[PDB]
C-alpha cells in the first residue's frame, strides 16, 4: 500500500492521497480531489500511495511542467508505472520532435475541418439515440447514450460496419473496465489484430476514412509502418471513448440536479457552447503525468531522475487561484480557465471532436427531454483514476414533458 519515503523527499511535503481511492469520493470525484487544494497544502506534494509519486496541486505548476518535456517526459506518463507496462499507443509516450510527426497525421483525421463536415452525422447519431430513449421515461444514461454515441462516431469516422461494434465495445471495455476475463495486453492485442488487416487493405485500396488516411500517411519522412499505424489508430478509438462517456455523464448528472441551468440552455440555446466550456472546467476528469528525465529543482523542490509526477489536468480548473468560486457552475463565467484537455504538445488532439460531441448532445437532448431527474433512490457513484467517471446514471422523466423533433 504505502511505499517508503525516498531519501530526497522531506517529510513536510508528504500528503495522504490515493488517486484511485480518494477519501471524500461520495461527495463527488472532483470534490474529493480538491482536498489537495486546501488552505495549507503545498503546491507540490509527495504521496506514499501507488508506488510513491509527486503531485502538482495547482494550475500554474501543472501548466509549467506540461510545457517542459525536456525535464518532464511522457515516456512514462501513468501512475502506477506498471499500469502502462503493455501500453504502447501512439503518440502518448513520445516527445517532440517525433510526437509532432504523428500529430500532423492525426490532424488529418480529427482536425477542425474534418469535424466541421462531420457535424451533420454527429447530430443524426445523437438525435436517433435520444429519440429512441425519449418515450421510455427512463434510461441509464451511461450505457444508453454515453457509451454508444462516441463508439458509433468512431465507426463512422473510420469507415467501419455497425455489426463490429459489439466486438470493439467488448475489447475496449476489457482494457478500461477489466472483468478479470482478459488482461489489458490481451485486449490491446485483439484490438490491434482487428485493425491491422483493415490498415493493410486500405493502404493498397485507399479511401477517405480515418484508417485509410492513417495507413497512407508519412511520419519522419517515410511511410508509416503497419505497427505504428495500428498503435495510433488504437488510440483514436480508445482516446475518444471513456473520457467522453464519463464527461457526458458528469454533465448530465449535474443538469439532472439543476433545473435552473437546464432552463437557461432551453431558453437560450446559443449559450450551449459557453456552457459546455464551463462544464469541461467543472467536471474535468483526467489525471496523468510525466517522468523526470534528470534531477531537477522545481519550485524549490528537489526532484530526482526517475521520479514520477502526477500533473492532474482536473485540478487546474478547480484551482481557486485561477477561477473564483471554482465549484460554482456559471454559464456566464467571464474567464473560464482549465486544462481539461491537457496542456503542452500533448493537449488532446481530439479536442474539437470532443467539444462537438458535447455541444450536439446537450442541444439534441434538451430539445427533446428538457425535464429530467436522477431516479429516486438512486445512489450515484463516482470512480477515481487516470480517467475518473460515473459508474451509472439512472435518469427518469415524464414523457408528457418531452417532444420529438
Amino acid at each position: 500500500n504505502l511505499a517508503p519515503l525516498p531519501p530526497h523527499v522531506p517529510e513536510h511535503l508528504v500528503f495522504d492521497f490515493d488517486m484511485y481511492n480518494p477519501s471524500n469520493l461520495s461527495a463527488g470525484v472532483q470534490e474529493a480531489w480538491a482536498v489537495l487544494q486546501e488552505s495549507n497544502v503545498p503546491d507540490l506534494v509527495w504521496t506514499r500511495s501507488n508506488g510513491g509519486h509527486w503531485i502538482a496541486t495547482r494550475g500554474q505548476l501543472i501548466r509549467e511542467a506540461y510545457e517542459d518535456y525536456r525535464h518532464f517526459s511522457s515516456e512514462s506518463p501513468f501512475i502506477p508505472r506498471e499500469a502502462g507496462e503493455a501500453y504502447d499507443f501512439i503518440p502518448t509516450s513520445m516527445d517532440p520532435p517525433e510526437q509532432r510527426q504523428f500529430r500532423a497525421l492525426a490532424n488529418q483525421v480529427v482536425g477542425m475541418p474534418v469535424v466541421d463536415k462531420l457535424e451533420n452525422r454527429i447530430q443524426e447519431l445523437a438525435s436517433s439515440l435520444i429519440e429512441s430513449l425519449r418515450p421510455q421515461g427512463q434510461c441509464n444514461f451511461t450505457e444508453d447514450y454515453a457509451e454508444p454515441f462516441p463508439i458509433r462516431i468512431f465507426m463512422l469516422l473510420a469507415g467501419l460496419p455497425e455489426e463490429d461494434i459489439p466486438h470493439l465495445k467488448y475489447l475496449t471495455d476489457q482494457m478500461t473496465r477489466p472483468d478479470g476475463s482478459m488482461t489489458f495486453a490481451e485486449a490491446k492485442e485483439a484490438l490491434y489484430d482487428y485493425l491491422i488487416p483493415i490498415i493493410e487493405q486500405r493502404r493498397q485500396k485507399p479511401g477517405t476514412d480515418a484508417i485509410s488516411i492513417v495507413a497512407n500517411g508519412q511520419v519522419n519522412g517515410r511511410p508509416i509502418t503497419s505497427d505504428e499505424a495500428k498503435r495510433m489508430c488504437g488510440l483514436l478509438l480508445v482516446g475518444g471513448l471513456d473520457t467522453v462517456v464519463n464527461f457526458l455523464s458528469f454533465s448530465m448528472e449535474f443538469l439532472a440536479k439543476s433545473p435552473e441551468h437546464r432552463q437557461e440552455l432551453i431558453e437560450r440555446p446559443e449559450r450551449i457552447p459557453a456552457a459546455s466550456e464551463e462544464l469541461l472546467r467543472r467536471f474535468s476528469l483526467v489525471a496523468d503525468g510525466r517522468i523526470l528525465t534528470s534531477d531537477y529543482e522545481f519550485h524549490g523542490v528537489q526532484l530526482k531522475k526517475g521520479d514520477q509526477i502526477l500533473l492532474p489536468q482536473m485540478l487546474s480548473g478547480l484551482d481557486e487561484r485561477e477561477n473564483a468560486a471554482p465549484m460554482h457552475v456559471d454559464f456566464s463565467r467571464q474567464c473560464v480557465s482549465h486544462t481539461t484537455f491537457g496542456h503542452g504538445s500533448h493537449l488532446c488532439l481530439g479536442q474539437h471532436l470532443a467539444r462537438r460531441e458535447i455541444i450536439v448532445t446537450l442541444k439534441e437532448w434538451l430539445t427533446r427531454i428538457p425535464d429530467f431527474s436522477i431516479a429516486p433512490g438512486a445512489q450515484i457513484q463516482h470512480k477515481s483514476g487516470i480517467v475518473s467517471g460515473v459508474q451509472a446514471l439512472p435518469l427518469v422523466w415524464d414523457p408528457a414533458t418531452t417532444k420529438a423533433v
Binding site: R63, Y66, E67, P97, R100, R103, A104, N107, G111, M112, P113, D116, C335, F341, G342, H343, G344, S345, L347, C348, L349, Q351
Partner: protein, 106 residues
Amino acid sequence: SKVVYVSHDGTRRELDVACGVSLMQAAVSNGIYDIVGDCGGSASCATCHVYVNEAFTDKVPAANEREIGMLESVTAELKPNSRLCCQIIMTPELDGIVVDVPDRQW
C-alpha cells in the same frame, strides 16, 4: 476589435475578435483552416504561425523566450515578423491588425 487574416493565396478574412482572445483562437473558432492551433495555444507546436504586418509590430508585445524558441521550428519561412498567433492576445490597441498566414503549418 478587428483582425484581418490574409491567406497565402491573398484571400482576406476579417474577424471581430474580443479583448483577451488569442488570434489563433479566433482563427480556429471561425474556420480559418490555414491556422491549425494543434497544441491549443501554449507555444508548443508552431502550427499557428503568422506574419504580423509591420504596421503593427511595434504595437504587439514582443515575443518571449518560449515563443522565440518555438518559432525556430516553424515549417514555412521564418521571418523577422513571424509570430505564433496563439501568443498574440487581442486588445483595443491592436484593432485593424493584419496578419499573413503561410502556406503550411505542419
